[PDB]
C-alpha cells in the first residue's frame, strides 16, 4: 500500500543514571522508559503500518550495549508485553479519522547475567516501515 509520512525520523530515550547495586541480580532491570514513533497522512487504502526493528544483538539476544557498561543489554517492548528484539515486527492500525499511526514503545536496561559494571549505555535501534 502507499506509504505514510514519517513524523519521528529520530527518537531518543534517556535511561539516565542507573546504580550498579540495582543491577546486581541476574535478570535485574531498570524502570521502563517510554519512547514513541509517529506517522501522518496515511493515504486512503493504507490501514496498517508494520514496523520492522533491527540492531546489533549480543549473546543474550537482547540489544547489545555499544557503550562501556558491562553485563548490560537493552530491551525494547511495545505497550502490551511483547519484546521487540532484532528482526521483530509490530503492526498498528491507522486511525481512520486522522489517517495517522503511532507506536507507543518502551525501553529498559537489563542485566541477564547480573553484575552490571560502571560505564556508558549506548545503542541504536533502526526501524523500517511497510504499509498494507
Amino acid at each position: 500500500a502507499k506509504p505514510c509520512t514519517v513524523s519521528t525520523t529520530n527518537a531518543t530515550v534517556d535511561l539516565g543514571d542507573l546504580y550498579s547495586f540495582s543491577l546486581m541480580s541476574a535478570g535485574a532491570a531498570s524502570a521502563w522508559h517510554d519512547v514513541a514513533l509517529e506517522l501522518t497522512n496515511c493515504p486512503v487504502g493504507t490501514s496498517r503500518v508494520t514496523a520492522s526493528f533491527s540492531g546489533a544483538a549480543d549473546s543474550t539476544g537482547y540489544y547489545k550495549n555499544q557503550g562501556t557498561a558491562q553485563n548490560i543489554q537493552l530491551e525494547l517492548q511495545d505497550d502490551s508485553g511483547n519484546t521487540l528484539n532484532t528482526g521483530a515486527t509490530k503492526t498498528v492500525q491507522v486511525d481512520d479519522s486522522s489517517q495517522s499511526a503511532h507506536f507507543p514503545l518502551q525501553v529498559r536496561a537489563l542485566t541477564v547475567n547480573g553484575g552490571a559494571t560502571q560505564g556508558t549505555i549506548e545503542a541504536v535501534i533502526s526501524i523500517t516501515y511497510t504499509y498494507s
Binding site: N10, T117, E122, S126, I127
Partner: peptide, 13 residues
Amino acid sequence: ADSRIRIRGYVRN
C-alpha cells in the same frame, strides 16, 4: 532506516 531510536544512559558504581 525510516526511523531510529537512540538509547542513552549511564551505570554508576
